[PDB]
Design a protein around this motif. Structure first.
Motif, PDB file in Angstrom:
ATOM      1  N   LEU A 182       0.929  -1.214  -0.056  1.00 29.45           N
ATOM      2  CA  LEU A 182       0.015  -0.043   0.045  1.00 29.45           C
ATOM      3  C   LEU A 182       0.899   1.123  -0.095  1.00 29.45           C
ATOM      4  O   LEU A 182       0.397   2.326  -0.126  1.00 29.45           O
ATOM      5  CB  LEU A 182      -0.977   0.250   1.537  1.00 29.45           C
ATOM      6  N   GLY A 183       2.168   1.007  -0.050  1.00 29.28           N
ATOM      7  CA  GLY A 183       2.975   1.910   0.060  1.00 29.28           C
ATOM      8  C   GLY A 183       3.048   2.961   1.558  1.00 29.28           C
ATOM      9  O   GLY A 183       2.250   2.370   2.296  1.00 29.28           O
ATOM     10  N   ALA A 184       3.687   3.857   1.664  1.00 26.51           N
ATOM     11  CA  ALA A 184       3.803   4.413   3.095  1.00 26.51           C
ATOM     12  C   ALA A 184       2.713   5.242   3.179  1.00 26.51           C
ATOM     13  O   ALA A 184       1.985   5.596   2.164  1.00 26.51           O
ATOM     14  CB  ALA A 184       5.054   5.435   2.874  1.00 26.51           C
ATOM     15  N   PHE A 185       2.355   5.311   4.232  1.00 19.81           N
ATOM     16  CA  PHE A 185       1.256   6.266   4.811  1.00 19.81           C
ATOM     17  C   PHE A 185       1.950   6.885   6.357  1.00 19.81           C
ATOM     18  O   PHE A 185       2.549   6.225   6.978  1.00 19.81           O
ATOM     19  CB  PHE A 185      -0.087   5.794   4.774  1.00 19.81           C
ATOM     20  N   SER A 186       1.204   8.012   6.720  1.00 23.28           N
ATOM     21  CA  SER A 186       1.343   8.440   8.158  1.00 23.28           C
ATOM     22  C   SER A 186      -0.056   8.588   8.690  1.00 23.28           C
ATOM     23  O   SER A 186      -1.134   8.311   8.094  1.00 23.28           O
ATOM     24  CB  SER A 186       1.743   9.792   8.151  1.00 23.28           C
ATOM     25  N   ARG A 187       0.004   8.715  10.006  1.00 27.09           N
ATOM     26  CA  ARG A 187      -1.395   8.868  10.816  1.00 27.09           C
ATOM     27  C   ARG A 187      -2.360   9.901  10.120  1.00 27.09           C
ATOM     28  O   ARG A 187      -1.819  11.081  10.165  1.00 27.09           O
ATOM     29  CB  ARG A 187      -1.050   8.980  12.261  1.00 27.09           C
ATOM     30  N   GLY A 188      -3.420   9.308  10.374  1.00 30.11           N
ATOM     31  CA  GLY A 188      -4.735  10.232   9.787  1.00 30.11           C
ATOM     32  C   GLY A 188      -5.292   9.767   8.430  1.00 30.11           C
ATOM     33  O   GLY A 188      -6.464  10.340   8.221  1.00 30.11           O
ATOM     34  N   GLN A 189      -4.652   8.683   7.892  1.00 31.62           N
ATOM     35  CA  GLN A 189      -4.894   8.108   6.371  1.00 31.62           C
ATOM     36  C   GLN A 189      -6.026   7.216   6.444  1.00 31.62           C
ATOM     37  O   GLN A 189      -6.716   7.032   5.612  1.00 31.62           O
ATOM     38  CB  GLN A 189      -3.766   7.988   5.420  1.00 31.62           C
ATOM     39  N   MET A 190      -5.591   6.323   7.455  1.00 33.39           N
ATOM     40  CA  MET A 190      -6.446   5.126   7.415  1.00 33.39           C
ATOM     41  C   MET A 190      -7.433   4.801   8.476  1.00 33.39           C
ATOM     42  O   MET A 190      -7.415   5.861   9.372  1.00 33.39           O
ATOM     43  CB  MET A 190      -5.635   3.673   7.584  1.00 33.39           C
ATOM     44  N   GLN A 191      -8.301   3.938   8.237  1.00 37.49           N
ATOM     45  CA  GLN A 191      -9.104   3.449   9.429  1.00 37.49           C
ATOM     46  C   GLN A 191      -8.447   3.112  10.426  1.00 37.49           C
ATOM     47  O   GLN A 191      -7.143   2.665  10.388  1.00 37.49           O
ATOM     48  CB  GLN A 191      -9.829   1.994   8.984  1.00 37.49           C
TER      49      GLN A 191
END
Ligand SMILES: O=C(O)c1[nH]c(-c2ccccc2)nc1C(=O)N1CCOCC1
Length: 145
Positions: free
Chosen positions: A104-113
């Motif tokens: 899913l690639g990188a993400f930071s907090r705030g983006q996912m469930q």
């Protein structure tokens, strides 16, 4: 113990283990935060799933309980070495990211469930979570970075 990890004793065996209530991970050895992490996941949807439908199957009809047996199988076969994450995620995940070996690639907090995200940030690099539930279905997350 690092935070999130509860010492527990094994029901069947009497080998004392460790349990993370965030990732739902279980591991025998004792255990021991970044802006972005990278994870793949293997989603198995169910009938109560927010969107009860994937590339694998037009209407999903399995029950949450059956979703969970499927995931536990996957989790066991991966853990034993008898399949790998990416392979299973490729064949069996109900997310459109299946074709990218769950990734899913990188993400930071705030983006996912938030359960996926809290579970995602609690894993160390390389660790697979236990079953993680969100409104999509149940997940196996492996944080890659
Ligand atoms: O169909 C999919 O491909 C799907 N994939 C995911 C997903 C969930 C978490 C992280 C990455 C992807 N959710 C879904 C899903 O059901 N959604 C998106 C939101 O949850 C409600 C409906």
């Amino acid at each position: 113990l690092p935070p999130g990890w509860e010492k527990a004793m094994s029901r069947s065996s009497g080998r004392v283990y460790y349990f993370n209530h965030i990732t739902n991970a279980s591991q025998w050895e004792r255990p021991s935060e970044p802006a972005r992490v990278r994870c793949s996941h293997l989603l198995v949807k169910h009938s109560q799933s927010r969107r009860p439908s994937s590339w694998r199957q037009e209407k999903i009809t399995r029950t949450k309980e059956e979703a969970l047996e499927l995931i536990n199988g996957y989790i066991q076969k991966i853990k034993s070495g008898e399949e790998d994450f990416e392979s299973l995620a490729s064949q069996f995940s109900d997310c459109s990211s299946a074709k990218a070996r769950g990734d899913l690639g990188a993400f930071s907090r705030g983006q996912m469930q938030k359960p996926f995200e809290d579970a995602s940030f609690a894993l160390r690099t390389g660790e697979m979570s236990g079953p993680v539930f969100t409104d999509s279905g149940i997940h196996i997350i492996l944080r890659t970075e």
